[PDB]
Amino acid sequence: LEEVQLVVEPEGGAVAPGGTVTLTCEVPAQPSPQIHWMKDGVPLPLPPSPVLILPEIGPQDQGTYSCVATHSSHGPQESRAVSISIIEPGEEG
Amino acid sequence: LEEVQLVVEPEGGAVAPGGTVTLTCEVPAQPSPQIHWMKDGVPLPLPPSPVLILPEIGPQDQGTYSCVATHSSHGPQESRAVSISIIEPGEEG
Amino acid sequence: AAEPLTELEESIETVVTTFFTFARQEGRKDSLSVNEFKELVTQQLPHLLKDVGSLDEKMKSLDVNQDSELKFNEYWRLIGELAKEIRKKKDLKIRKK
Amino acid sequence: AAEPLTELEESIETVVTTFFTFARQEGRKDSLSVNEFKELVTQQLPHLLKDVGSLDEKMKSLDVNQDSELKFNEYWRLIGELAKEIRKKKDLKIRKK
Known part of the structure; x- marks a missing residue:
């Protein structure tokens, strides 16, 4: 069962300079609770939101995205750290 | 002037295997207070003594000796760490 | 409950x-979350940690193990450094003047 | 030398x-000795540790490393057990009733 469903719009993971990556972290089992944002390599100071929209991603906006959602049965668990990085000019999808 | 005068019997610093090194820490400014025996590199739990006699120094007894004399003004005052080590058969001086 | 314990x-x-x-601030009153972690470091530990x-x-x-829950043993790794910095932070x- | 610090x-x-x-009870008031350790465990930790x-x-x-001195970092090894046992002893x- 997926305790933390991290769905990124660009499933390719890697995008081009200035790309827009939408981070959606919800639960297909339990209702969407307080989802805290965690990103290795300096996390982004943003409020706990289920859908994080990061448009025009710069070279300093890279990092592995993880969603720390406070579960009722369990607790505030992390997820798979998706390495959102910038590659050569092109599209991945 | 020095807060802690670290005077060693063998002025050289290094001795031969099984040599005797006497650590004498005096204070040419204030009466001899609580001298803490500290050795950079495996410190020994030796009782506060002004003259530490270390005879027949072995390979594990080597180390940079320092005497933390607790003065009235200068409490945890460390001294110059003398590299008391073992060398090839000979004498320094 | 936490009855009066010994000196140690x-x-x-x-x-x-x-x-x-x-621990009882957020959900799961047992471990600290990433929120509390950051809130502590950048507020309750600016004098303790040299990096906030x-x-x-x-x-x-x-x-x-990717838990995001600072529980027993896991949080001990930081507790040890904290209890160490209080003695060798830069003294x-x-x-400690 | 030990002024009121922050919450953490x-x-x-x-x-x-x-x-x-x-530590200042005996010689080498920088850390604890084996004697103090012995007394601490059996006299102050009979309720904390199941073995004295x-x-x-x-x-x-x-x-x-045959230090025979409960100094910083090394003493933390026991502290991490103590702070853990006080909560996960058999709870x-x-x-903790």
Whole structure:
């Protein structure tokens, strides 16, 4: 069962300079609770939101995205750290 | 002037295997207070003594000796760490 | 409940009471979350830690199993450094004036 | 030298006070000795530790390099056990009553 469903719009993971990556972290089992944002390599100071929209991603906006959602049965668990990085000019999808 | 005068019997610093090194820490400014025996590199739990006699120094007894004399003004005052080590058969001086 | 402990238990108890204070703040009153972690580092630990910016490296060094829950043993790794800095933060000459 | 610290610093300081107390009790008031360790376990930790007789193994775990001195970092090895046992001794079901 997926305790933390991290769905990124660009499933390719890697995008081009200035790309827009939408981070959606919800639960297909339990209702969407307080989802805290965690990103290795300096996390982004943003409020706990289920859908994080990061448009025009710069070279300093890279990092592995993880969603720390406070579960009722369990607790505030992390997820798979998706390495959102910038590659050569092109599209991945 | 020095807060802690670290005077060693063998002025050289290094001795031969099984040599005797006497650590004498005096204070040419204030009466001899609580001298803490500290050795950079495996410190020994030796009782506060002004003259530490270390005879027949072995390979594990080597180390940079320092005497933390607790003065009235200068409490945890460390001294110059003398590299008391073992060398090839000979004498320094 | 936490009944009056011994001289050697009350010392660590103080850590437990303070810990539980933040543990019951968010969900899962047992471990601290990433929120509390950052809130502590950049507020309750600016005099303790010499770095209040970077926390992702230190945090992942605790719960290397990716738990995001600073519980027993996991959080101990930081507790040890904290209890170490209180003695060797930079007092190699003078820190606790 | 030991002025009132912050919320998270006073918790660890509470342990330091006790540590310093037994440290300055004998020679080498920088850390604790084997004698103090023995007395601490059997006299102050009979409620904390389930074993007050086989302190040799616990002591040796901190001795490691034959230090025979409960100094910083090495003493933390036991502190991490103490702060853990006070909570997970046998409270997996019930203990801190």
